Design a protein around this ligand. Structure first.
Ligand SMILES: Cc1cc2nc3c(=O)[nH]c(=O)nc-3n(C[C@H](O)[C@H](O)[C@H](O)COP(=O)(O)OP(=O)(O)OC[C@H]3O[C@@H](n4cnc5c(N)ncnc54)[C@H](O)[C@@H]3O)c2cc1C
Ligand SMILES: Cc1cc2nc3c(=O)[nH]c(=O)nc-3n(C[C@H](O)[C@H](O)[C@H](O)COP(=O)(O)OP(=O)(O)OC[C@H]3O[C@@H](n4cnc5c(N)ncnc54)[C@H](O)[C@@H]3O)c2cc1C
Ligand SMILES: [Cl-]
Ligand SMILES: [Cl-]
Lengths: 483, 483
């Protein structure tokens, strides 16, 4: 992992101006910009083909500030409103400079993606869910339309989703129709790609400039020269158990990144040169229960207490459950509401969890679940008293979802229903330069995507990973192509 | 911050075998061991005198496994029981190798401290509090005698406190009687000290070995040669705002380390060489309300819900409040119980917070506090139903503290009552060698105390900082003195 001195490289197996490690969203975006700038670009991919986790993703891309898609669907937004939301939802300690930059450039970035051939349907999906069941292009994806954020920033949906039939998240998701037009663009520009390239070490000259990389390809060591810059774009550290334990131990035993190649190597390679890190504890957290069920009940913790409005983003429900309720949750839902939720339109019918307990009364359900007498009954009594008036003054679930819980009543056992991926990584500038602990860029070294600390510092919104990876991937390619 | 090449050092201002940066607990312990091993030892201290944060501390030192002090006070313990507790309480992701080592060596370490002249009174203080009001030597300090840990490990008090009259935490605390006998020991051994030394940069040779440091002393740059090793012992990063934002943003605006010199420089200096880090998000959190009040009431969050047994360690109450209840807490307490708590013996009478609201009934108190109708009433009704039977089945506060809340009733406003210090830092071995991201020690470089990730990975127990700093300080001195 220690850097290799360039003087010890006897021959270069490959050479380019800009060498991009990783052919996912950040890597392809960097390749396009670098090639447009006139650089000779070579992408190094560890597997046998392009796409990475991006091709398996739902395809949300977190964009706003008044995109053509938001306008076509009748939703106002601005860069200031988007920034207000993201600072509140994606912290604490969110990078104000980076978020401001991302928001100010968002509409241009949407148009840039469309120019590369990424298609979006001018239609909005408005029901709770993890993704649009159909090929709709816009959806709420960060809890913008739920408490507390709906009182902090004006709600606007920012989940932009490429148009695709037969989306299968985890196999070939909406994220595939982000990657494919970008790959076609890169290929037409003359971007080169080498496969089975497992990048291992950075090569530096006696000034400390990064001037190439060492990799294993087809079983043997190879050295790749980078005349202008190396862009690290190899993904997260979710599958590196030692790093999870040391940095993000809330994910011990509940890994949820899309691919195994997310082993943190590029973070380590850069740390070896003195690169700085940020938010290494930050984690996306999914909650594997269908949102159409969740929104029609109340979530309670292991003490029978409500703790999150049930109409926020499911990922935020995941974080609140794992982080603050010791990963213990139950959905309390009356039989009629469960039936309505189970019949509702969803992209994830496989997440329709069946109730574990069912009873004629809340008092019986409470004793069935092993809760102390009154713990659940009181929660339901107080909820119902205010719900009869359409009001949730405790957690501010929107009134359209608020009504008394009736009988018979059921409980879904949602203990240990979370998993996630890492959000921390290398510290980078808005130009995607990797920062040394001195606060200065490391010459020749750029990075984007989930090997970096991006727009999310703590909280997460769906789309921010493909959003920041593509946005800052572009910046890394622009910067790396400079002479 | 980038390392200085030794070839560029034209003259060394000072030279020693073992150079210790920082004259607090970790630094003095390292100095004693290195000098006992026959090394020429030089301590570099940034301020005008020794002691650092240690001299201002309450003086708890987290020790167990059957110390002479535990035995004299009639408390059984073993290294296995101590390990079981610490793994459960100081995680998640606690370092099992390090905790096991610390527990197996704890009794020897207690005896080592006594041999150096640290005095302890053979007496135990049993009432809730932040420290013994008098000169008692033993106290519970980590919630060992409260849920959930009292069902996971056999309770044993491990807060060992040096004997001292007129202890004033933040000025000259019990921690002073840890530091003073150790300084006397170090002085008799011939340990040298230079003051106004602000260490800035490590010096490396062409193999990457750390062979000295560069510092500013008395206004000018100086270079200090370390023939055998450099021990970094300069404290935490709590006062470095940029590092707090990037790594531990839960502490933004609520700093609570004892001294300003905790600016993270040694963490950065070592990262520049490729040193690895762990648990950079981990934070001790104090809760600035007297424990004799807290234990006689119920704590509720901003939704009027209980969330922590009120007889656990106050620091754990702090963490639960800041981390999981958005820093919002209120103590609900009846007038009679408040009077009894306010009259109880404490080291911290200045933390006797006065109630903000007082009412004849819980229903009135609830509406006074702005809580929704029923939110607080139901909490108190359920608590009281079980408390009439001496039982807290929700949070398992011990029965001796459980009884119905009566009337009139008051609420203390404990929103924004937390502050803390950082627990993350350099990754070190059990021999206090600083680890590179490669997993190999950096030659010549050792570290201990709050510039390192020690026994705490997340949770905190009082005494673990002076405990691990002194224990791993010894190891750093032993390792650094080797040829
Ligand atoms: C179920 C699920 C759904 C998701 N849906 C969304 C979504 O809708 N919107 C969103 O924003 N995020 C989503 N994500 C997250 C998103 O998929 C990833 O965070 C994102 O794709 C990472 O982009 P990247 O360019 O950093 O990594 P990738 O797209 O994974 O690309 C990294 C590439 O680097 C290669 N690589 C790894 N190591 C090396 C090496 N040593 N040498 C050379 N190459 C290497 C990999 O094989 C890979 O091709 C989802 C995640 C999950 C688990
Ligand atoms: C109110 C309060 C009470 C506490 N009580 C306890 C307790 O009872 N038990 C417990 O375990 N913990 C307690 N702590 C924590 C404990 O005080 C510290 O964590 C511990 O003293 C740190 O030990 P150290 O050796 O790392 O740092 P220190 O003891 O602070 O020593 C570090 C030394 O390095 C010097 N230094 C800094 N930078 C440089 C530099 N660049 N060059 C040279 N020198 C430098 C400093 O001036 C200082 O003298 C308490 C904290 C607070 C805030
Ligand atoms: Cl992923
Ligand atoms: Cl401190």
């Amino acid at each position: 992992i220690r850097p290799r001195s360039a003087t010890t490289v006897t021959e270069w197996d490959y050479e380019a101006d800009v060498v991009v490690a990783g052919y996912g969203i950040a890597g392809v975006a960097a390749s396009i910009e670098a090639a447009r700038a006139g650089a000779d670009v070579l992408v190094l991919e560890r597997t046998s083909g392009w796409g990475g986790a991006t091709a398996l993703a739902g395809g949300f891309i977190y964009l706003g500030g008044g995109t053509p898609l938001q306008k076509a669907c009748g939703f106002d937004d601005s860069p200031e409103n988007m920034k207000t939301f993201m600072m509140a939802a994606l912290g604490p300690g969110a990078d104000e400079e980076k978020i401001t930059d991302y928001c100010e450039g968002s509409v241009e970035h949407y148009n840039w993606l469309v120019d590369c051939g990424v298609p979006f349907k001018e239609s909005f999906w408005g029901e709770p869910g993890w993704e649009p069941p159909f090929d709709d292009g816009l959806m709420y994806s960060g809890g913008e339309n739920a408490a507390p954020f709906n009182e902090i920033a004006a709600p606007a949906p920012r989940g932009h989703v490429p148009q695709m039939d037969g989306k299968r998240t985890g196999e070939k998701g909406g994220g595939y129709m982000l990657m494919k037009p970008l790959v076609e663009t890169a290929e037409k520009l003359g971007v080169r790609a080498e496969y089975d390239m497992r990048v291992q070490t950075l090569v530096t000259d006696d000034t400390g400039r990064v001037v190439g990389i060492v990799a294993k390809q087809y079983g043997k060591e190879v050295a790749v020269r980078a005349r202008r810059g190396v862009v690290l774009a190899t993904g997260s550290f979710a599958y590196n158990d030692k790093m999870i334990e040391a940095h993000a131990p809330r994910l011990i035993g509940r890994p949820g990144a899309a691919i195994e190649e997310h082993d943190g190597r590029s973070i380590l390679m850069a740390q070896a040169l003195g690169a700085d890190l940020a938010h290494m504890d930050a984690t996306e957290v999914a909650f594997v229960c269908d949102p159409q069920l969740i929104v029609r009940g109340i979530l309670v913790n292991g003490r029978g207490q409500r703790y999150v409005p049930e109409d926020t983003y499911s990922g935020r429900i995941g974080q609140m459950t794992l982080f603050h309720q010791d990963n213990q949750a139950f959905l309390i839902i009356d039989e009629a509401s469960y039936e309505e939720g189970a019949a509702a339109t969803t992209a994830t019918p496989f997440l329709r969890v069946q109730p574990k307990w069912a009873a004629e009364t809340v008092e019986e359900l409470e004793s069935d679940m092993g809760l102390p007498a009154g713990a659940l009954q009181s929660t339901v009594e107080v909820y119902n008293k205010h719900a009869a008036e359409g009001s949730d003054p405790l957690l501010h679930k929107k009134s359209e979802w608020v009504k008394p819980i009736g009988t018979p009543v059921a409980a879904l056992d949602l203990r240990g229903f979370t998993l996630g991926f890492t959000l921390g990584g290398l510290r980078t500038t808005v130009n995607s330069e990797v920062l040394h602990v001195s606060g200065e860029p490391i010459p020749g070294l750029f990075a984007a995507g989930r090997c970096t600390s991006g727009v999310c510092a703590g909280g997460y919104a769906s789309g921010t990973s493909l959003g920041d990876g593509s946005f800052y991937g572009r910046r890394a390619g622009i910067s790396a192509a400079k002479q």
